[PDB]
């Protein structure tokens, strides 16, 4: 009926690109570069914050059968995002994505797309629909974040200060494996369990059941804490090893 | 596994031939070498690359993926020609969306003189109909061009509806701009003739109550040639597009400019009093002029026309399969 | 596009009804017998008929009424077609100049409405106050005959009863009453309704609903002094006037059932009945007089007179000579006597009227090797049923060969001097178990004669129960001397084997000429056949050899020589089978996408396949493969009566709906979509049913004949009788021609005021399109019989196109020649 998208961290170490070489170093930069790319096109275009994600998630998938050595990853990025517009109904045309990709991307990076950029990024749709086994429609995290949140009930102020942290985390995670690793329904609880650890709430209080200390049940099933400790986990990481900090 | 898509050749079907044109690329029939079932391949090429692989083509495969349901008809997967091999540039094959197929369409079966349909024909005919939009409308789907070319009918008796070429996603809470033109105009609804820029779900009713209407009488209710001569003709049977039934119908672009001859009073009812009257308060609901009081897919299967059909006891359609070659 | 010329060779000559009255003159005494499209206006005299005019209308002829309202000196007539053009005539002569009146008229179609079964009824109320139609499901429709609804303005009254079989409008009522048999799941029922032009609507009506025969099926209005109706079922005729219910049940009416009836007494003492085994009644209303001076009615008695022609409608000449018009035979006038002759018959017929009746199939033969050829068609059913030998010769010559039985199929065999024709007689279950015929007829009368041994179909153990009384079909292939036509050879196939497709051809290496026959195993439990054969026999020195036989899962319905090859219709395959060396059918290839393969045809390597409701596709062989190809199929779903293969590029086609449409390759290959899409190119409303499409034509053909711009030779046949040409044109001659119609149109003053240009265009219940790609004929040819002036009203303004032709202006005196030229093809 419908594939499976997900796999263990330890599968990780067996995409194409870690076997010919490409060290997991190499192979999560050059997923945040090209996750980032087609955010930032995307933001430049005008487009939804789901239109981004769809592109972002096609791109990770995408790079689970095939190596970074032989698809450069911003021809990708670029086809994803326009495929991903006409999934969203968001489309725009492929000369103004290639427009504000060369806006973005300095000469050596702009080399990817060789001598015809447009023609290049639309080649590539056909592997991108075959590689993606033409399962278009995708959840993010961020309904699931609103649909939670509209049931919690208490302080305003309190919990959209927990909305907003929590949303820069889901746009965070985007340029991780995360998107690879869990359902969306659990990165936006583990984004709600983050941003209420950091700012000193306790969610329990804000819900239909109170003295229910593992809040999140009600809205996910079968979810442990490990599972949403692992999740946290990785998102501080990308703050630490960069030179930015928790929002709050 | 059966979820990956794309990749199987379309050698696996032979082509028994053209079965119709479809607005993206031309329909075959087909059978399975492997299974032997008879199946509709719908031809979608990106060879043009004018923009790449059609969005018509995107939306029935991105929403039919989604809806599961006897009234919907299956896109069982979806096959490649021979592709080139190596070179993936230079790769401008086809892909084929691969359907059930059905034997019939309900514009066929009316367009032979006697296909006659019985009342309890017609509650077996419209409930799944109905069933299928309230379907489709729960999760928040519009499949706008509803027409007796996209019902599709089995000799089982089964109705699927089938081009979802032009469906969207419609929100209540978040109205967008929509396409002006997305009926076909035989079966348009008044909102749309009048230029509504956000369609609700009870377009598609309009249009379903158009055929209801015209499973009665074997002959289409509102047939124009022009948008004008459409609300006219609605007009004259429905009444006149006036404040005092739909209070909102002022704040639609073309209502000032597009004035019907007289601003008429509705005689559905009496133009159609040979139709049951269970039956005829369903066409009245359904052929409501303003969207807001017309009634939703769920309602007309709560009616009394619809609501204690069984289709376990599936009424087969008028089978004149010997008197009619010799009459 | 493409550009046809349809002409019509042979008139209709069906009867389709019949009335007499006070038409021409309030002191003469008409019959006008109405054939599609066309009224016959005659004058009765003590010999026969005089003929006094003859009119056609745009549009077929539903309803004709004769009636004649306060203030009028003679009748007037009221007609109104089948797309709903109603309107008044009257009959104006002044000394030698004839001409007919449009009073009235108008279209009386409803935007919204369901058309009835029993179709449309149209009554005229004694004191002719109004005209009832019944045209929808659930609505009666009045027009007020007032003196200034000279537009036939009309209103509906909603009608309760959904399902009505007939309505009369009653005598002796003190309102306008209408009596009408109806059905309901109860059964079928008699009720009455008073009609209010006042108030617009039904009233109460003057008596009960009696609940009548399940199969009630004609409702007689019976004058004073009786009043009240008659209903007359397949079983009995019962008589209701309120309180007053009688019935008789006579035996001899339910072996046959009756379709006619007719007053012969004003005062309704003596009615007659007609029924389809062609038996004519007199139905007797036995009067009784009760000393308050009262007429009642004291019973209803039924007299069996004679056998006439079966009879479609029915009149009586006051002379005592009663007109038979039939549209399944020869139409007649009997004379009834009073003294029976000695074989116990009160009929005896005067004069027969030639009606090529059902034309079920044709073949264009030349048997004399005159060259012209001969156009020998199957024509009439049941008793009716003959061969028809037709040639040109200004008339023409028509021989006439009886069978009394069905006929379906002909072919022509030349090495055997004789034709090949496919029969069906009925035979009716009798109290042997086995069945018996009604009457002797050709499959009987045959000099030599064989059954079918097969025992394909023998293991059976599926049963079929008999009842007495039953009737079934007896198909059998004759052998017919094509000098004589005497039935040499008679073969009768397998019980409930109907035989369905015939041709002759030599196949293969196989230096015989055989006669190939398929048929179908036909069980009234099978919505469709699931068996059949394909048999060939061989016709040699007076007896039919029966050669081999394949069996199929399914219906012939029809087969082609193909190449040497033989070319099926088994219910959705089309299949080309190889004659084999040992004598036996051999399947080649099969083609599948049909869901029924009714009508074929073939040119060269290509293939025409007309379908119940997918219209037509052009197949291709493709002989380096050994299989089929699909070429183009027309999109547009249309129900096929037949087919024809005009040339490579043009295909022609017949709907159900007396419609006539041309297919094209759409020869704009660009992408293989739209090689495959055949365009609709024209259509036409025949107004006729075409059943058989032949190439050929009867013109006396000879070393230098006289030719014409017209090219090719289309002959077809119709229900009605009609044969008609279809023809192709150049660019050229057809913008001249159609130009010439659009003069034509406003100079010609129309029956009715029916403008052409709806009665030809594309026409069903759902659709209506302008006519597009075809020429009228019997338009361009009436140029020849419109006054003078109207000729150079005509001609005026008349230019040529594109050059390489002649000088623009044309003159009258140009296009008489011009017109006869075209004259010649007819
Ligand atoms: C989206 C509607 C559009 C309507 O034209 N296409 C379409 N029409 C179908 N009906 C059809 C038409 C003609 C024939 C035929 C022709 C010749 C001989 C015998 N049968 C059979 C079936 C159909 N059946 C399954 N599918 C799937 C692809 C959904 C279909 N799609």
Redesign the interface.
């Known amino acids: 009926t419908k594939p499976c998208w997900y796999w263990d961290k330890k599968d990780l170490a067996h995409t194409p690109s870690q076997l010919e070489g490409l060290d997991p170093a190499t192979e999560a930069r050059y997923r945040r570069e090209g996750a980032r790319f087609i955010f930032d096109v995307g933001t430049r275009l005008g487009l939804h914050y789901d239109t981004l994600a769809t592109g972002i998630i096609y791109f990770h998938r995408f790079y689970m059968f095939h190596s970074f050595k032989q698809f450069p990853r911003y021809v990708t990025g670029a086809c994803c995002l326009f495929l991903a517009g006409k999934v969203e109904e968001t489309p725009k045309k492929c000369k103004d994505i290639i427009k504000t990709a060369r806006s973005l991307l300095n000469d050596v990076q702009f080399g990817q797309f060789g001598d015809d950029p447009k023609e290049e990024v639309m080649v590539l749709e056909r592997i991108l629909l075959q590689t993606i086994k033409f399962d278009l429609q995708v959840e993010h995290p961020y309904q699931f974040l609103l649909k939670y949140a509209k049931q919690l009930k208490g302080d305003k102020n309190k919990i959209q200060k927990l909305v907003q942290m929590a949303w820069t985390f889901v746009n965070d995670s985007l340029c991780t494996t995360l998107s690879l690793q869990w359902e969306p329904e659990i990165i936006a609880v583990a984004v709600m369990y983050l941003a209420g650890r950091l700012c000193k709430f306790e969610i329990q209080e804000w819900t239909s059941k109170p003295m229910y200390r593992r809040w999140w049940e009600q809205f996910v099933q079968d979810v442990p804490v490990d599972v949403l400790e692992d999740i946290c986990h990785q998102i501080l990481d990308l703050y630490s090893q960069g030179k930015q900090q928790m929002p709050h | 596994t059966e979820s990956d898509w794309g990749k199987r050749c379309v050698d696996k079907f032979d082509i ?6 479809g607005t993206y ?2 329909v075959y ?1 087909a059978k399975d070498k492997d299974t032997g079932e008879l199946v509709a391949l719908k031809k979608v090429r990106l060879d043009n690359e004018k923009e790449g692989f059609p969005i018509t083509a995107i939306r029935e495969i991105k929403i039919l993926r989604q809806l599961i349901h006897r009234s919907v008809v299956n896109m069982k997967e979806i096959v490649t020609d021979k592709q080139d091999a190596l070179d993936f540039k230079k790769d401008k094959g086809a892909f084929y969306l691969v359907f059930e197929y059905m ?3 309900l ?7 006697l296909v006659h349909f019985s009342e309890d024909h017609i509650k077996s005919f419209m409930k799944q109909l109905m069933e299928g939009l309230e379907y489709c409308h729960k999760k928040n789907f519009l499949h706008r061009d509803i027409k007796c070319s996209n019902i599709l009918l089995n000799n089982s008796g089964q109705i699927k509806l089938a081009d979802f070429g032009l469906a969207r996603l419609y929100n209540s809470e978040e109205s967008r701009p929509y396409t002006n033109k997305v009926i076909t105009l035989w079966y348009r609804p008044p909102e749309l003739l009048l230029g509504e820029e956000r369609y609700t779900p009870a377009i598609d009713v309009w249009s379903c109550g158009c055929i209801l ?1 015209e499973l ?6 509102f047939q124009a040639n022009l948008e004008l001569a459409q609300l006219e ?1 609605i007009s ?2 429905c009444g006149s597009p006036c404040p005092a039934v739909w209070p909102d119908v002022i704040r639609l672009p073309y209502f000032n400019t597009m004035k019907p001859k007289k601003q008429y009073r509705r005689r559905l009812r009496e ?4 139709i049951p009257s269970a039956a005829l308060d369903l066409l009245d609901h359904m052929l409501t002029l303003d969207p807001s009081k017309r009634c939703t897919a769920e309602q007309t299967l709560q009616s009394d026309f619809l609501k204690d059909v069984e289709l376990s006891k599936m009424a087969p359609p008028d ?1 004149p ?2 008197q ?3 009459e | 596009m493409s550009y046809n010329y349809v002409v019509t060779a042979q008139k209709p000559t069906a009867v389709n009804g019949c009335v007499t009255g006070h038409f021409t003159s309030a002191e003469d005494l008409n019959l006008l017998i109405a054939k599609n499209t066309r009224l016959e206006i005659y004058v009765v005299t003590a010999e026969g008929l005089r003929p006094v005019k003859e009119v056609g209308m745009y549009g077929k002829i539903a309803v004709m009424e004769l009636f004649r309202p306060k203030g009028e000196s003679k009748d007037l007539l009221f007609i109104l077609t089948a797309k709903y053009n109603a309107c008044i005539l009257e009959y104006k002569q002044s000394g030698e100049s004839i001409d007919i009146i449009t009073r009235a008229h108008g279209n009386v179609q ?6 009835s079964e029993t179709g449309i009824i149209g009554i005229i109320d004694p004191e002719c106050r109004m005209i009832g139609l019944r045209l ?4 009666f429709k009045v027009i007020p005959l007032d003196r200034d609804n000279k537009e036939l303005k009309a209103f509906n009254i ?1 009608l309760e009863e ?1 399902h009505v079989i007939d309505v009369k409008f009653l005598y002796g009522c003190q309102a306008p009453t209408i009596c009408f048999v109806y059905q309901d799941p109860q059964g079928r029922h008699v009720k009455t309704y008073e009609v209010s032009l006042r108030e617009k609507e039904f009233n109460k009506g003057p008596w009960k609903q009696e609940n009548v025969e399940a199969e009630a099926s004609m409702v007689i209005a019976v004058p004073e002094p009786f009043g009240g109706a008659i209903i007359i079922g397949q079983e009995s005729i019962t008589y209701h006037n309120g309180d007053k219910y009688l019935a008789i049940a006579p035996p001899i009416i339910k072996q046959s059932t009756i379709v006619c009836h007719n007053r012969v007494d004003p005062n309704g003492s003596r009615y007659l009945l007609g029924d389809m085994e062609g038996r004519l009644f007199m139905l007797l209303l036995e009067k009784e007089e009760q000393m308050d001076g009262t007429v009642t009615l004291k019973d209803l008695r039924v007299e069996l007179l004679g056998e006439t022609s079966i009879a479609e409608c029915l009149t009586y000449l006051d002379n005592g000579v009663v007109f038979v018009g039939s549209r399944l035979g020869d139409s007649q006038l009997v004379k009834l006597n009073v003294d029976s002759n000695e074989q116990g018959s009160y009929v005896v017929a005067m004069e027969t009227f030639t009606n090529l009746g059902p034309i079920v199939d044709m073949c264009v033969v030349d048997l004399e090797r005159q060259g012209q050829g001969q156009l020998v068609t199957c024509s009439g059913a049941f008793k009716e049923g003959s061969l028809r030998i037709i040639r040109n010769g200004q008339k023409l010559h028509i021989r006439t060969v009886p069978l009394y039985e069905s006929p379906r199929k002909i072919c022509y065999q030349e090495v055997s001097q004789c034709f090949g024709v496919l029969s069906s007689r009925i035979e009716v279950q009798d109290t042997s178990g086995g069945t018996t015929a009604l009457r002797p007829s050709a499959s009987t009368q045959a000099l030599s004669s064989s059954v079918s041994s097969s025992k394909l179909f023998s293991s059976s153990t599926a049963p079929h129960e008999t009842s007495f009384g039953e009737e079934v079909e007896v198909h059998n292939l004759l052998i017919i001397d094509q000098h004589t036509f005497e039935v040499l050879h008679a073969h009768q196939f397998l019980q409930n084997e ?1 035989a ?1 497709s015939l041709v002759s051809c030599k196949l293969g290496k196989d230096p015989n000429t055989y006669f190939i026959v398929g048929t179908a195993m ?1 069980y009234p439990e ?4 699931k068996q059949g054969r394909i048999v060939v026999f061989q016709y040699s020195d007076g007896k039919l050899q029966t050669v081999a036989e394949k069996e199929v899962k399914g ?1 012939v ?1 029809s087969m082609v020589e193909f190449n040497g090859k033989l070319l099926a219709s088994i219910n959705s395959t089309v299949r080309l089978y190889e004659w084999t060396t040992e004598k036996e059918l051999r399947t080649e290839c099969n ?3 049909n ?2 393969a ?1 009508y074929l045809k073939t040119k060269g390597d290509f293939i025409l396949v007309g379908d ?3 219209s037509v596709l052009l197949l291709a062989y493709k002989p380096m493969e050994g299989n089929f190809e ?1 070429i183009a ?1 027309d ?1 547009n ?3 096929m009566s037949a087919v024809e293969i005009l040339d490579d590029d043009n295909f022609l086609g017949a709907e ?2 007396f419609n006539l449409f041309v297919c094209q390759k759409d020869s704009a290959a660009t992408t ?2 739209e090689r ?2 055949l365009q609709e190119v024209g259509l036409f409303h025949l107004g006729e049913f075409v059943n058989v499409f032949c190439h050929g034509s009867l013109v006396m053909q000879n070393l230098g004949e006289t030719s014409t711009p017209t090219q090719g030779s289309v002959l077809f046949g119709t229900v009605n009788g009609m044969i008609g040409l279809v023809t192709s044109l150049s660019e050229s001659w057809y913008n001249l021609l159609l130009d010439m119609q659009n003069r034509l149109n406003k100079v010609i003053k129309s029956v009715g005021k029916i403008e052409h240009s709806f009665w030809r265009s594309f026409h ?3 659709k209506t399109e302008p006519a597009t790609g075809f020429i009228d004929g019997d338009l361009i040819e009436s140029f020849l019989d419109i006054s003078r002036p109207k000729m150079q009203e005509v001609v005026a303004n008349l230019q040529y196109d594109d050059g390489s032709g002649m000088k623009r202006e044309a003159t009258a005196d140009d296009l008489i020649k011009v017109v006869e030229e075209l004259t010649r093809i007819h």
């Not at chain 2, 028994?16 to 044109?21: D, V």
């Not at chain 3, 409803?110 to 058309?115: S, W």
């Not at chain 3, 099978?526 to 056949?529: F, G, I, L, Q």
Request: with cysteine; net charge negative.
């Open positions: 028994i031939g053209i079965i119709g044109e690329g031309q029939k034997d019939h369409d514009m066929g079966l009316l367009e032979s003189g209407g009665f009488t074997k002959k289409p209710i003709l004259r049977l133009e159609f009093s040979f089978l399969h010997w009619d070659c010799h | 409803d935007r919204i409405g369901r058309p929808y499901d659930g609505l909603r959904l109907y369905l036909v099978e919505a469709e056949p219906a319905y083609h599948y996408n869901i029924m009714l119940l409701m997918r699909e199929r999109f779903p249309n129900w159900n709906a293989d979509e495959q899409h069903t219940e759902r």
